[PDB]
Amino acid sequence: MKPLVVFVLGGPGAGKGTQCARIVEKYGYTHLSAGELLRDERKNPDSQYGELIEKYIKEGKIVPVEITISLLKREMDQTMAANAQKNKFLIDGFPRNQDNLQGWNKTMDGKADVSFVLFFDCNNEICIERCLERGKSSDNRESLEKRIQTYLQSTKPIIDLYEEMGKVKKIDASKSVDEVFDEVVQIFDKEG
Template sequence: MLFRILGTLSKKVSDAVYRAALAMKPQVVFVLGGPGAGKGTQCSKIVESYSYTHLSAGDLLRAERGREGSEFGQLIDSYIKEGKIVPVEITINLLRKAMEETMKLDKEKFRFLIDGFPRNQDNLEGWNALMRDEADLRFILFFDCSNQVCIDRCLERGKSSGRVDDNRESLQKRIQTYLQSTRPIIELYQKKGKVRTVDASRDVDEVFADVKSLLDKEG
């Protein structure tokens, strides 16, 4: 009798934990910085040491661009080649789908690094309109380095990356887009006390040491 009662209680607790997991919102950290600031590299290192899933807005868009039968592929391709920002509805749809699929496979995977988003005011407004009630934004992780460092890194990366936008002409456009559109977003969140800045001009391991210290402090 006792074991049956304990078994029933255990099942109720398990069911409650399961329902809580299903109801849990994704915990999001926006990762921002100029092209070549090292966002992707640092996100990969974070994933190795912490329970985060890395979602790159750019990688998702590039994958969708190359997906056979994609209704948005050609549109995304033209935006990326021009160094312009893809319409927010497309990007958010891809991010939401990726988060949902991740959490469906593993309920413990509810922390996300969203790399390269939001990139402008339109992105931010789209996120607030479509995702504010679906995900909790913890803070912005900002990798800060000079424009010249960004350009040099991207040109070096372009020798092997195969990315159509890792060339000097596209880079100049991307830098201007970043300065005009993304930096104001970072400054807006700085005023709210939600930006954690890391000097990204240094060696990868030096940068990550600062990132680890910051994440350990945030919990």
């Protein structure tokens, strides 16, 4: 009964959301979205970390990663307490940079194993248009272009580190939802 974690990496528009939902359905992973857990903790009344988060906001300071790690760990402990068999976790929105990942490795050593990392990779333009189309059918180009470049700059040392561990599963995210999922099923049927 030790939690297994798969970090999902890729810029905005890389098809993370649709593949995560498919992995949850087929393999019974629990999907954790670090960005969502932080926003809910910030809003929810008398949340564990709501008033701490507001200190940082009032100060104009970054919310420390230690809070994000604590939220991810709490979600994993509650999932497994409620059902000892749901030991598999898909985490997106984390880690964003190598300092975040170092905080994870230092704090969660002996509490969780990172099985592998999914890297949804395709050219900037496909990612930019998916985000624009999504926005249209419900950011401008130059905002998305900037977020995609800073994200890939930020996560390159994370990718490099997991390559050295042999733990990167690179996906061609340029393909259609069903072809990307076929690549995902190959990885998850193998290790999973």
